[PDB]
């Protein structure tokens, strides 16, 4: 038997709980669990478990160049080291292991550019 | 269950009993390893009757 917590030891790389009862970490909602939850349409449960309980975080992407931006509400930093004067930063909901995945792709000399969903406005 | 401090003033490299069912300390010894260095050996016992789920 095992029940842990809303908190505990996490992995330094992925930011996710450690594996199993031995590490005093969490339990895995694996690939097949997400298939079942998607088949049920339960997307708020996926956000609760895969994002709020595993490693969900905030990512900042500059609108004009699609590259990761640097934002900090306290100690105000609103900057982007690709245009540096036209920065238009939006916050997108992500996971740490996904940002690690994108940094690893760029480490292999593959440029990852995120095209944000465009603004939409009522007519006139 | 085992107190262990490393000197740099000290860093607490201790071992905590991380189990949801309590135990009783059954045997403690400090034997000498292959490199003639002391290590701590602890034996913990659990009184296990049959119960639901066994």
């Amino acid at each position: 038997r095992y029940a842990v917590a809303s908190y505990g030891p996490t992995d330094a790389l992925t930011g996710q709980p450690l594996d199993g009862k031995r590490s005093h970490g969490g339990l895995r909602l694996g690939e097949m669990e997400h298939w079942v939850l998607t088949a049920q349409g339960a997307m708020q449960t996926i956000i609760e478990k895969s994002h709020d309980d595993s490693d969900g975080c905030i990512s900042y992407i500059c609108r004009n160049c699609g590259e990761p931006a640097i934002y900090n509400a306290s100690h105000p930093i609103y900057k982007c080291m690709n245009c540096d004067v036209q920065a238009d930063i939006g916050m997108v909901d992500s996971r740490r292991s996904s940002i690690v995945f994108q940094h690893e792709m760029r480490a292999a000399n593959v440029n990852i550019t995120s095209v944000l969903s465009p603004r939409v406005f009522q007519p006139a | 269950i085992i107190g262990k401090v490393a000197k740099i003033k000290y860093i607490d490299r201790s071992v905590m009993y991380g189990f949801d069912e309590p135990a009783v300390v059954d045997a403690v010894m400090r034997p000498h390893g292959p490199n003639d260095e002391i290590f701590g050996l602890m034996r913990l016992r659990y009184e296990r009757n049959l119960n639901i789920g066994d």
Binding site: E31, W35, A39, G41 | -
Partner: protein, 290 residues
């Protein structure tokens, strides 16, 4: 697990859109989900009574002769056309299969027969007197209901406006149109008042709306789960199946031949069913054996 993961990654992008179509981000996979637009959890097996009947038993049971109006000649004529079209389609399906026999039993969203039975049970009235005005009226209500039936797939705004219906949505209401004309025939609704007809028609439309597939349902994941699950019992067998060359049906060899789209040269259990031309040769077994 190997077949489950490959089936899910190939199908998970299939999602129901606001037209009840299945598409991959824009690209149609189905014009209508399941070709009927229904959820698989909202189906009932129901028998269609006219399928097996002959031309005389059909005219004995369903042709109404109480009123000598040309409407009931047309009502029965639509029963034969539905009967003939059902036979033609599913006899053809019997042709291009090994052992897929025709049936007079379908899975439908609404059991029209049980709805009529329940209301007849709760009716204070018993046998109604012959009211020719109401018999003609109930016929018009049912005929209008079937004509407006495909609007279940659009909305009540277009039903009020009577805008044109897409052809593929007329076809999706064909089994329910067919069933309603059998179970709400004049010979079967003589003890039903016009107020009780409105209750029946309103109940059918409500239960038909409740059986439609939801917008944005991951129906490709649903299919992969439903088709991969029986493969476990398929694999639990295969010491009950042939393993010889030319008839290898062990493990998951035939499923892999289908899902990998393997060419005919890579098929280990291929078969074919040849039907004789001459009917006299057909009955004789020595003719078939030679």
């Amino acid at each position: 697990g190997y077949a489950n993961r490959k089936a899910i990654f190939g199908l998970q992008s299939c999602i129901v859109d606001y037209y009840r179509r299945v598409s991959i981000d824009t690209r149609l996979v189905q014009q209508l989900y399941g070709e009927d637009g229904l959820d698989a959890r909202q189906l009932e097996t129901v028998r269609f009574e006219t399928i097996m009947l002959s031309d005389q038993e059909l005219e004995d049971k369903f042709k109404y002769t109480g009123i000598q109006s040309p409407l009931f000649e047309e009502e029965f004529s639509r029963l034969k056309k539905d009967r003939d079209k059902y036979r033609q389609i599913f006899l053809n399906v019997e042709n291009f299969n090994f052992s897929q026999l025709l049936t007079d039993v379908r899975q439908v969203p609404v059991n029209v027969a049980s709805i009529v039975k329940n209301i007849l049970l709760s009716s204070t009235s018993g046998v109604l007197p012959f009211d020719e005005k109401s018999i003609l009226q109930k016929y018009a209500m049912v005929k209008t209901f079937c004509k407006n039936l495909p609007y279940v797939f659009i909305n009540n705004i277009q039903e009020r406006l009577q805008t044109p219906i897409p052809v593929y949505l007329k076809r999706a209401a064909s089994l329910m149109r067919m069933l309603i004309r059998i179970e709400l025939a004049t010979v079967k609704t003589l003890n039903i008042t016009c107020e009780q007809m409105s209750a029946i028609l309103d109940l059918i439309r409500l239960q038909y709306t409740q059986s439609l597939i939801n917008y944005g349902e991951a129906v490709g994941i649903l299919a992969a789960q439903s088709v991969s699950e029986p493969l476990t019992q398929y694999m639990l067998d295969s010491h009950h199946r042939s393993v010889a060359g030319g008839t290898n049906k062990s493990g998951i060899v035939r499923p892999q031949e289908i899902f990998s789209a393997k060419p005919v040269e890579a098929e280990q259990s291929s078969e074919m069913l040849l039907r004789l031309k001459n009917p006299e040769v057909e009955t004789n077994k020595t003719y078939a054996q030679e």
